[PDB]
Design a protein around this ligand. Structure first.
Ligand SMILES: [Fe+3]
Length: 349
């Protein structure tokens, strides 16, 4: 009864991976709902495709594999233009994590200019490498629902291609943005943990706090820089997608600051580019540390613990669940000691 009353005071969140379906289908604005200033607003042929990707995404259910999508010649050509113009900047703008996983994506997921990668290939790739998976989404989800996905290391992705009239421009996150922006970093473990941190911190949180985490998501996952060996590199997906803002964030005429969760979450997210400032993290371990610490400030009666074996959320409400966690850590520390002893036994140190 005590636990029942505890959850009634906080917003609903999926406690099982199967319950995440409720978040995936709560689309506030479907992809077929083109904006008035959209370059394909009068394109009936384009609207037909946008409606097609919506229906495909709406048909997705947990456990079922992501259906293969036959992209048209125009859509592949549009992908090809984006793929080339961004590849000319990556070895000088993208972080080390990006350049390490991108060739792997070319090998296993078919990242080419003459072929649009399928989500099912990407999902199996990410799961095997960082535990992340992707889901097709029919449109825009609330920040609460999208972040809830990250708590399970599930990234909701679009499948549609931007309008072919201008491949170097997109008002919305098309599949080119997802595959070339988010995916190559999702394959990195330290980044995956960092992305999952934001998600776990949103579970059961207030709308005000969720909006803050969404802002932190914006100026990191979407528009973030990382200092690697003095040189400045972009890791934000929004930067790795826009060829113009990518070179700008690493230019001299751009205001560059450091990622401070309490201050950054108050910064204004500008959809109409560019951004007023770009925040920098030293690493994805520090970034994870920044969100691991920031979650303490968010008000909720409990703390959450992700169970990767059952893909569920453990609510730490009593001393029993807490003691259970500590005991597991004592077992893991024992394994650490064993490895230490075996190292002394063989390496003589
Ligand atoms: Fe994005």
């Amino acid at each position: 009864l005590y636990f029942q009353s505890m959850l009634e005071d906080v917003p609903w969140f999926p406690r099982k991976i199967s319950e995440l379906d409720k978040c995936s289908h709560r689309v506030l604005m479907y992809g077929s709902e083109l904006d008035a200033d959209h370059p394909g607003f009068k394109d009936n042929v384009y609207r037909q495709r946008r409606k097609y990707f919506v229906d495909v995404a709406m048909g997705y259910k947990y456990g079922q594999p992501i259906p293969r999508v036959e992209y048209t010649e125009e859509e592949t050509k549009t992908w090809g233009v984006v793929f080339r113009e961004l590849s000319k900047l990556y070895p000088t703008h993208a972080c080390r994590e990006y350049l390490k996983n991108f060739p792997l994506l070319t090998k296993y997921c078919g990242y080419r200019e003459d072929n649009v990668p399928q989500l099912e290939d990407v999902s199996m790739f990410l799961k095997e490498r960082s535990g992340f998976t992707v889901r097709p989404v029919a449109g825009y989800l609330s920040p609460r629902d999208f972040l809830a996905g990250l708590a399970y290391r599930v990234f909701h992705c679009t499948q549609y291609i931007r309008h072919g009239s201008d491949p170097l421009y997109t008002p919305e996150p098309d599949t080119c943005h997802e595959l070339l922006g988010h995916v190559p970093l999702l394959a990195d473990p330290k980044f995956a943990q960092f992305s999952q941190e934001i998600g776990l911190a949103s579970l059961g949180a207030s709308d005000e706090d969720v909006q803050k985490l969404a802002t932190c998501y914006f100026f990191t996952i979407e528009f973030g820089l990382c200092k690697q060996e003095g040189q400045l590199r972009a890791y934000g997906a929004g930067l790795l997608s826009s060829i113009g803002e990518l070179k700008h964030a690493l230019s001299d005429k751009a205001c560059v600051k450091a990622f401070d969760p309490k201050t950054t979450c108050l910064q204004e997210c500008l959809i109409t580019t560019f951004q007023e400032a770009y925040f920098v993290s030293e690493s994805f371990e520090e970034a994870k540390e920044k969100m691991r610490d920031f979650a303490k400030s968010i008000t909720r009666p409990f703390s959450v613990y992700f169970n990767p074996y059952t893909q569920s959320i453990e609510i730490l409400k009593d001393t029993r669940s807490i003691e259970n966690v500590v005991q597991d850590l004592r077992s893991d520390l024992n394994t650490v000691c064993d490895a230490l002893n075996k190292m002394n036994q063989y390496l003589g140190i």
